[model samples]
Target: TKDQRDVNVFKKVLENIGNAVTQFNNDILAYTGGDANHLIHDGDAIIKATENGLQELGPQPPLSLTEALALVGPVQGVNKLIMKTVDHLIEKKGPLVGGGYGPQVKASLQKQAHAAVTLSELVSSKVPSPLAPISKQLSDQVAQALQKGIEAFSI
Candidate 1:
């Protein structure tokens, strides 16, 4: 089970990613890699920084999108290689998530535990791609499931 601090961290991570979505959709600035010089070093720094934040943010659960992402900034924001790896994971398994999703829900939780794990292995060592579009899909489905869980649990 995740703690409150973990939930809060994901909340923050989701808010940051949401900013990227808006920035991308608007085409305000060429791409969403932060600042003008989108260099590999920048990505490295982001990865390290976010890794630190995740440590501080504590353990997060996957079903809640905001809470899930609360601890995922810097890395997703900066690093092309690592971020791309994550993107690949999302793109592959995204569509596989249909109505009945038990095992996946468990796997998604595993992603939370071993966050360093790349996106593809989340689907069993499949080749991953950034352009696959799993981030949006994971965010949407997980958010929906968590919302229902929270509502049901509350009542």
Candidate 2:
């Protein structure tokens, strides 16, 4: 019964992460479209919704051994979307803030993205098993994506 419960909890957590990913990508496209002010203005609301979804399993950090393993796929997928958009923006504008907005907006969006990944990592890092390594790896990748996005800002 305990195993079944674990499986159920894991399932719920994954579902929540999936939901968060959907919400994040849905709103984040506006930021990628060369409009950073939109993000700075509405970014907190979008990130807040996704954070609620990610924290659906709990209210604090360190999601626990049961929750983190279920997160790797969605987390990485979200991060992948973030990276792709950031790269596209860079290619199109030459810099994160050089196109439709300035450094303030771009910087704000990057921080929001970073907060999203870091919050996910708070949960994933607690996983303790064969899944832990995979979780950690994905979490690290997401962090790097945010970092890269931030670097695109020209100060």
Candidate 3:
């Protein structure tokens, strides 16, 4: 029963992550800044929402994407940092922990997360928008970043 309970807890935590993702989408809708049909640049609000959500999970030095959200005072780290930590622990453990996937998993997660940051920064970063732009860029980049952050738990 303890095992079941633990699994349930993790399931709930994961579900919350999923819900956050959706709420983030709604927030973006509001940030559309008028025309809903606008392309990517129109969803700046969503970008902020997603980034803020992830930054809440982990506090970084000098304000990473999460820091940017912290700077604004809107980015709230995840209430259950415990969950992320536990997940990472299991990832490090093997066999019973389900992390037997081996170094390939670690390598892949690292590579993927790294790629996500690079991709996300392409739009935002220390500078501001320049061209016609896409507001969703922020949301998209941060979302990708969040995935990396969660994967970091495994590391």
RMSD of 2: 4.5
* Tens-digit lDDT string for candidate 1 (10-126): 445434434443332233123333332222233233334435545644432333444334334432442343334334333323322332332443343333324433321232121
Question: Which runs in model 1 stand beyond 4 Å of their true positions?
Answer: 1-6, 14-38, 59-155
Give per-candidate clash totals.
10, 1, 13
Q: Each candidate's root-mean-square deviation in Å?
A: 16.9, 4.5, 18.6
lDDT of 3 by residue, 128-149 (tens): 2331143244435445454554
Q: lDDT of candidate 3?
A: 0.36
Every model's TM-score: 0.26, 0.61, 0.27
lDDT of residue 70 for candidate 1: 38
Residue 110 displacement (Å), model 3: 2.1
Name the candidate that leads on TM-score: 2
Evaluate residue 115 in candidate 2 and report its C-alpha lDDT on the 0 to 100 scale: 61
Per-residue lDDT over 55-75 for candidate 2, one digit per residue giving the tens place of the 0 to 100 score: 654543344454444455555
